[PDB]
């Protein structure tokens, strides 16, 4: 159906962007809103309300640029905003070598049903935060399975 | 001012802030503002954004060596319609011979539309505008803002 085709196109755009950023160890933080509304966090960023593309997602997270610090938040198959604030988790159970992008991802996942993707700037490792837990060192197949399950 | 007028002023502020930032850093840029001649055929050659304008997004689009930096950004009113768009290259003899493809594309679209195109040179940081087949070079920040306000 059209809705299914659109969802698959968005998953493909995300995975292509994440793969590029992982290869180059470009830090990224991408939160996908689900049933819990995230308007209060969307409002802390720069409004975009843009069509998703791999190209736009890559250009947002280039280091040393206006939009690269903070989270992209996606809603209704669009990029709602970039450079958004997310709450930092205080969980003592996050790997201690991880920094603030990952604590922000876990933090938003503790108070919403959202799915957040993180690319580490240290390793290019890809992780997902959901329900207060961080799933680390994902393969491409693993991230795609999580997006489809979501 | 009406909401339409306030929105126009915000869009001008966003454009001038981005152009000034790119000029300073010698970031090449090509930014076409659609007017009354519709530019759908050219918008459709790029990557669709349909995004709200911000200075931050404009700058991020043109960072060198990134997916969106080559080709034109085409704006419709208060939105960035698409990036990395193709424009026709002018063959006008009044384009300074040292200028490259971004200036030629800008003059080219300006020959077949009433659009206003801004160009930042990656070589010099100079700011120019193409309109109605003419290129106006070495604009001050003040001159660019006035041209946009009058447009
Ligand atoms: C568009 C400008 O944005 C910023 O300078 N920050 C830094 C920053 C750091 C952590 N979370 C969000 C943000 C947004
Ligand atoms: C999104 C990818 O964009 C591109 O690779 N282009 C568009 C474009 C438009 C005009 N001249 C050169 C190029 C290269
Ligand atoms: Mg002069």
Curated annotation (Swiss-Prot), chain A:
Regulation: DAC activity is stimulated about 20-fold in E.coli by coexpression with CdaR.
Keyword Nucleotide-binding tagged: yes
Expression induction: Constitutively expressed, part of the cdaA-cdaR-glmM-glmS operon.
Keyword annotations from UniProtKB, A to Z: ATP-binding, Cell membrane, Membrane, Nucleotide-binding, Nucleotidyltransferase, Transferase, Transmembrane, Transmembrane helix
Any one GO cellular component localisation term in the record: plasma membrane
Cellular compartments annotated: Cell membrane
Annotated disulfide bonds: none
BP term (GO), one: cAMP biosynthetic process
Gene null: resulting phenotype: Increased sensitivity to the beta-lactam antibiotic cefuroxime (CEF), upon overexpression of the c-di-AMP phosphodiesterase GdpP greatly increased sensitivity to CEF. Double disA-cdaA mutants cannot be made, suggesting they are lethal, while double disA-cdaS and cdaA-cdaS mutants are viable. Depletion of cdaA in double disA-cdaA deletion cells leads to cell lysis. Exponentially growing cells are extremely sensitive to H(2)O(2), no change in response to methyl methanesulfonate.
Enzyme kind, highest EC tier: transferase
Membrane topology per record: Multi-pass membrane protein
Catalytic activity entry: 2 ATP = 3',3'-c-di-AMP + 2 diphosphate
EC number, UniProt record: 2.7.7.85
Domain DAC: from-to ranges: 1-140
A GO MF term: ATP binding
Subunit details: Probably a homodimer. Interacts with CdaR. May interact with GlmM.
Physiological role: One of 3 paralogous diadenylate cyclases (DAC) in this bacteria, catalyzing the condensation of 2 ATP molecules into cyclic di-AMP (c-di-AMP). Upon expression in E.coli leads to c-di-AMP synthesis. Probably the main producer of c-di-AMP for the cell; is probably implicated in control of peptidoglycan synthesis. In B.subtilis c-di-AMP is a second messenger that mediates growth, DNA repair and cell wall homeostasis; it is toxic when present in excess.
Family label: Belongs to the adenylate cyclase family. DacA/CdaA subfamily.
Listed name of the protein: Cyclic di-AMP synthase CdaA
Source organism of this protein record: Bacillus subtilis (strain 168)
Gene name for this UniProt entry: cdaA
From-to range in the entire protein, with total length: 103 to 252 of 273
